[PDB]
Amino acid sequence: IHWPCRLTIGSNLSIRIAAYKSILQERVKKTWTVVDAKTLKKEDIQKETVYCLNDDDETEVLKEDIIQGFRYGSDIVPFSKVDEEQMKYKSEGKCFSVLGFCKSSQVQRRFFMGNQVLKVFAARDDEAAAVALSSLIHALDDLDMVAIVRYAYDKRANPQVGV
């Protein structure tokens, strides 16, 4: 499946693009289901998790009665989830933009992050975009530059950078 987006350059250039994950690590999609050792059924099988009091007690703590927190040096700060979700970084939805250009030799293979390779073309039914991307490819090959680009899958994903 393609990634239908629009590459943005400055504030006056946009090219409808479709990205394909050319490389994807193999991974099984069939999980293992624990069933009974006697009836061989999962119906009689389901977890029981208990938030028993960590202090000198054993009383379970209800889901709402318990919150998260984060270690801070020598202590831990009490923390909710509404607080972070209203003070988290807000990504600008699904977007993908270029940032700069540099020589190919300025980077090495040992700085290649992620677990997938994205082969990207323009969106379907835009032959002018095809000519534009072809010119981009030719110019980049001639100049031997590499484009520095910023990626963002969607609002709820983490924006990041790429080459």
Partner: peptide, 25 residues
């Protein structure tokens, strides 16, 4: 860093034991 699940009025990180029991029984 991963969060640490802790209480509200005591703010104590409550230990969470998890196990499985016979649902049909």
């Amino acid at each position: 860093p991963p969060p640490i699940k802790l209480y509200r009025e005591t703010n104590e990180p409550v230990k969470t034991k998890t196990r499985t029991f016979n649902t049909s029984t």
